[PDB]
Amino acid sequence: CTLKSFTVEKGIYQTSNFRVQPTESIVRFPNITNLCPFDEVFNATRFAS
């Protein structure tokens, strides 16, 4: 499949190189991010007029 033929001759042939498949998907992000204190807005004791 690299020589694009059906016969090959006595020798060594540099085909493609081998590399195991990269499969998964990693998305890591610093968890240092903290939730904005919206509780002070929604759970406020009294809303303005």
Partner: protein
């Protein structure tokens, strides 16, 4: 200015020969490359790496 060497001056004549009376063995050197490194390249992993 580059100096091409010590100007010598040879005394030609028409009835004078100059025959050496002694000799000298002189191991010189000469250095020659023969082969260079044998590289190779795979297209897909150079251009389209992963």
């Amino acid at each position: 200015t580059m100096s091409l060497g010590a100007e010598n001056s040879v005394a030609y004549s028409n009835n004078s020969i100059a025959i050496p009376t002694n000799f000298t063995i002189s191991v010189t050197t000469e250095i020659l490359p023969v082969s260079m490194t044998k590289t190779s390249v795979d297209c897909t992993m150079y251009i389209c790496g992963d």
